[PDB]
Design a protein around this ligand. Structure first.
Ligand SMILES: NC(=O)C1=CN([C@@H]2O[C@H](COP(=O)(O)OP(=O)(O)OC[C@H]3O[C@@H](n4cnc5c(N)ncnc54)[C@H](OP(=O)(O)O)[C@@H]3O)[C@@H](O)[C@H]2O)C=CC1
Ligand SMILES: COc1cc(Cc2cnc(N)nc2N)cc(OC)c1OC
Length: 165
């Protein structure tokens, strides 16, 4: 088995996206994200692809895979996959492909997943109807939660690192 991983950043309340963007500034999260995903396949939903600045995509040093129901969708510098099953196939021999968002794609991949790396951001965001939300993890997941750390931005964050099987 490839060890299928999910990686995301959420507010304590579970928001991951608002108005198409990440609704906070925590540089340290992007560092952790890169440190987690470098050298691996990164699988993402079409909307997440379009949320990435055009100048920042595809993510360098990683095989980019975009999931869309449209067989003719084009993602320059990425492979387009018609299902999470097809995306995982494209990861080939990668021992640890990572699913990197967003909300709909996390729900799709969750049944396949054996690792989650979650950054929690201490910011008071009240869930709105149009927010993208993190999936809820049940207690079949085990691992560790680090201490709260001060970001350069003045917010606190911490890492959660879970596995199952
Ligand atoms: N805080 C964080 O860690 C992160 C936050 N984000 C945020 O999350 C938000 C995006 O999340 P979300 O809106 O849910 O969108 P997603 O990024 O999950 O992509 C949704 C798209 O995936 C495709 N898709 C969904 N299900 C299937 C399926 N079963 N088979 C084939 N294709 C499928 C569809 O594309 P199509 O319509 O083209 O067919 C759909 O529109 C953005 O705001 C982004 O900024 C993103 C990544 C990380
Ligand atoms: C490298 O920059 C981005 C990375 C991500 C995805 C992402 C970001 N952080 C974490 N912890 N997990 C993720 N999947 C999402 C982004 O925007 C939606 C990014 O652009 C700022």
């Amino acid at each position: 088995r490839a060890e299928v991983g999910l990686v995301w950043a959420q507010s304590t309340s579970g928001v991951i996206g608002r108005g198409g963007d990440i609704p906070w500034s925590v540089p340290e999260d992007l560092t952790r994200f890169k440190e987690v995903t470098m050298g691996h396949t990164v699988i993402m939903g079409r909307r997440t692809w379009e949320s990435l600045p055009a100048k920042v995509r595809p993510l360098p040093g990683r095989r980019n895979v975009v999931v869309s129901r449209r067989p003719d969708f084009v993602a320059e510098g990425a492979r387009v996959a018609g299902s999470l099953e097809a995306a995982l196939a494209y990861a080939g021999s990668d021992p640890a492909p990572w699913v990197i968002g967003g909300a709909q794609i996390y729900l799709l991949a969750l049944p396949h997943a054996t690792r989650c790396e979650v950054t929690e951001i201490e910011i008071d965001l009240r869930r709105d109807d149009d927010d993208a939300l993190a999936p809820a993890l049940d207690d079949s997941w085990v691992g560790e939660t680090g201490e709260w750390l001060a970001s350069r931005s003045g917010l606190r964050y911490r890492f959660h690192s879970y596995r199952r099987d």
